[PDB]
Structures are given as C-alpha cells and as structure tokens.
C-alpha cells in the first residue's frame, strides 16, 4: 500500500483519527452489552476534547482578525483608534501563533 | 465539539480532499470547515443525526433514508449540474445497455445487471420500482433482495448483503471481502462503476445517470456503440435521454439536522467555497474535482454549484411526491 507522513501527522488529520478511534470505540463498547476499554475510551475522550478546544479558538481568532483587517483596511476615518486597531490585530496574531503551536504539541500527548 | 462546520467524509480519498478543503478555505480567509471519517452515509447520517458530524451530500436514495426517525435530517443544499447557462436540478435515471442486442424493457429477465448500489436512485430504487411488476414479489417475509435475484440471471449490486444474496454479488469485480463492497473498492461502485460493468462486458444492462455515458467515454463513435431502453420498450441513441429515461429526480444534495443543523453556516461555507473554488475559479484546488483513479469524492464531478433549499422543505417535499411515493411503494 502506500503514504505521505507529514499529511498524516498535520494537526487536521490526528484530530480526526482521533474522533474516528472515539467512534470505534463506544461502537465496540455497545457491540458488548448486548470495562478496561471504557478507560482507554475516556482519555481519548478527555484528550480530543483539549484538542477540540483548541481548534475551536484559532477558528475564533481567525474570524476575529479578518473582521479587524477589514475595519482597519477602511483606513480615511481618528489615529490612536486606529493605531488600536493595529495594536489589537498584533495581538491576536501572536495569540494565534502560540494556539497553533499549543495544538502541535498537545496532538502528540 | 467546535462551533465550525463540520464535513462528513465516507472514505480515505474523500478525507483528504476534505482537508485540502480545510487548509484552502483557512489560507483565503473563508469560513472553516473540518472533517469526520465514516465508510458508509448511514454512518453519516447517524453521525450527523448524533451531533458528532454537521453536514454530508446523499444521493436521493439516502436523502429519503436520512428523513426518517430516529434521523430526521433535511436537504439544505441541492448540487447544480449541467452548464453556466442552462444549469439543472434534476437528472434523468438511465438504463444502459449494448448496441446490436434486442432485448426490451419488459424483457430483461434471465439477463445480467449492473447497479449503482443498494437503494441508490438510478441504480436501484428506479430500475427496481420499474421492474416489480415483474418480480413475481410477494413481500415479507420475503425481502424485495430476493425477486430481484430470482429475475436477473446475475448482478452487481454494491452493498448488497453477500451472505443471504450471493447473486446479487456474483457479477462484481472487487477483490476477496471488497467485493460487492459499498465503496471504490468496489470498481463497478457507483455510477462510473455500474458503467464499467457493462463495458467489460460482464453485465448486460448498466443503471445510472443520463450524462455517465458522456462523462466516460470523450469519442462520439465510441458513444454510438451504446442505447438507452425507453420505457415503452424502444431504444435509442444515448443523447435521446429526454425522450428516452427511466425518471427524472432531483439531484444530491447536502442534508443537516432538522434542528441545529446550522443550516445558515452550511449555506455560508457552500456560497464561499463555490465562489473561491468551483468551476474555473482557482487553479489551486477545485471544489467539485477528484484526483485521477477518483471519482466524485464529496460532490459530483460535474457539478457547477449549489442551490439553496427553501426553509420549510424536508426530505420528503424535497425528492417530489412523485419519487417520494415510489419509495415508498417499493418497500
Ligand atoms: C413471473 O411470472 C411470469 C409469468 O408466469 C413468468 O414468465 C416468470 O418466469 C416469473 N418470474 C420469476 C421471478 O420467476
Ligand atoms: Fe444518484
Ligand atoms: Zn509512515
């Protein structure tokens, strides 16, 4: 058969496994009462989550700095609102730039 | 779980168009979209359903199952095919058989058959309503599985239960347990797949979709080697598909939950990417494209679009009384 690592190791990719082996699991946990795996089951559970999270905030981040740029962008109007403006959409890019880095590691935990 | 709009993937391939969706739509600036893994649109359904997916594309077969309880799922988004300038909602179910034989309609019993999938449109839930009268069915305890195994002499029928049907899977190229599997691994799977199955020349009629033939085959000569069965049992050239179809229906489209389906990001992400990425939009990544050796991975190959479902329409109002009580009559 055949793959490309780095595709698989991406962020995208090991959060969906990951929701994929959460799936699997409580299909073969019903698949059963019809106990050791329920523990397995609540780390990958409590480990997405964090994962979830994550993702979940650089999308808000995103949003809230494409809303920024555009209002900044409408740059003829004062300054100091402005120079807020700037300032805010630094700020959040170096947030977005520590999320990201927060998800990269976590996703090997 | 996150906010954002979630995809639904039934299969490898599909995954990773979906994360190429993912990373396109994060670098223009567009709403996001991430992905599920399943293998199968039940799966999809009930993830959907569960509240651990947001959104798949179902062909009419499963649109009509996704509508039932404990389900309850509604179309949002129909695809769009055809052209720019004449762009359809419908598609005509086809029967698809070889230039040279005579074989009617009314005459298909004892021959072999080539189908889309289990209660897929133009490959089962059409050709089979088409066909019950014939069936000799007497309904349960026997399943309509069994009629339709009893009057084809073989078949491929994807999906279909091996075990209790082996007949329906004899004709089917896959190999050891992916054959008659519902996926491509299958290879006579689907629409691309059923037509496969007749040019072999393993099957004798091949179930689908009006614009299959012209998708497959580029050469006109090659194309007049082919006929449609009309129903009032007369062929014709394949481009007579109007004057020559099985049913018209409504196309695929994407369906949600009844209620928090975040139907207005759906609709949103679809505007947005359609913009960005649909026909001749970007060379960076299409929206409605499939790598080579793929087919019709998230949305139909030749799609141009997507139209808007209005808000008080469920799956049953959506596919039509027409196709909406054969259906129903068919089970
Ligand atoms: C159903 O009945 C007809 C007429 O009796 C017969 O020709 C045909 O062989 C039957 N079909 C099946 C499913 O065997
Ligand atoms: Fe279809
Ligand atoms: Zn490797």
Not at chain 2, 175 to 186: D, I, P, R, V
Not at chain 2, 211 to 222: I, N, P, Q, Y
Not at chain 2, 309 to 317: M, T, Y
Request: proline residues 5%; charged residues 30%; neutral net charge.
């Amino acid at each position: 058969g055949s793959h490309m690592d780095a595709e698989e190791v991406a962020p995208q990719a090991k959060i969906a496994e990951l929701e994929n082996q959460v799936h699997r699991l409580e299909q073969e946990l019903k698949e059963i009462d019809e106990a050791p795996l329920q523990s397995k089951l609540d780390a990958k559970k409590a480990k997405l989550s964090k994962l979830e999270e994550l993702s979940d905030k650089i999308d808000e981040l995103d949003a809230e700095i494409a809303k920024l740029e555009d209002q900044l962008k409408a740059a003829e109007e004062e300054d100091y609102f402005k120079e807020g403006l700037e300032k805010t959409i630094a700020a959040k890019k170096a947030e977005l730039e520590k999320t990201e880095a927060d998800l990269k590691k976590a996703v090997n935990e | 779980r996150r906010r954002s709009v979630q995809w639904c993937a039934v299969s490898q391939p599909e995954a990773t168009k979906c994360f190429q969706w993912q990373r396109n739509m994060r670098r223009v600036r567009g709403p996001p979209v991430s992905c599920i893994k399943r293998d199968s649109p039940i799966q999809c359904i009930q993830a959907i359903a569960e509240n651990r997916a947001d959104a798949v594309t179902l062909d009419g077969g499963f649109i009509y199952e996704a509508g039932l309880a404990p389900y309850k799922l509604r179309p949002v988004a129909a695809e769009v095919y055809g052209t720019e300038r004449q762009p359809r909602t419908h598609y005509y179910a086809v029967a698809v058989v070889k230039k040279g034989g005579s074989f009617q309609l009314n005459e298909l019993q004892g021959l072999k058959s080539c189908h889309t999938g289990l209660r897929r449109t133009a490959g089962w839930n059409v050709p089979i309503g088409t066909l019950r009268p014939f069936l000799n069915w007497t309904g349960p305890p026997e399943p309509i599985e069994a009629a339709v195994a009893r009057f084809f002499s073989a078949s491929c029928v994807p999906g279909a239960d091996k075990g209790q049907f082996p007949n329906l899977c004899r004709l089917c190229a896959g190999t050891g347990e992916n054959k008659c599997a519902f996926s491509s691994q299958e290879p006579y799977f689907s629409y691309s797949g059923a037509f496969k199955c007749l040019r072999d020349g393993a099957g004798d009629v091949a179930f689908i979709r009006e614009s299959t033939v012209f998708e497959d085959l580029s050469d006109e000569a090659e194309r007049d080697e082919y006929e449609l069965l009309c129903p009032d049992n007369t062929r014709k050239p394949v481009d007579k598909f109007k004057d020559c179809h099985l049913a018209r229906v409504p196309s695929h489209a994407v369906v949600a939950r009844s209620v928090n389906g975040k139907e207005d990001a759906i609709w949103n992400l679809l505007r947005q990417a359609q913009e960005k990425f649909g026909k001749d939009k970007s060379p960076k990544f299409q929206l409605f494209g499939s790598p080579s050796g793929q087919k019709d991975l998230l949305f139909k190959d030749s799609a141009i679009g997507f139209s808007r479902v209005p808000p008080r329409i469920d799956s049953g109002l959506y596919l039509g009384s027409g196709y909406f009580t054969a259906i129903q009559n068919l089970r």
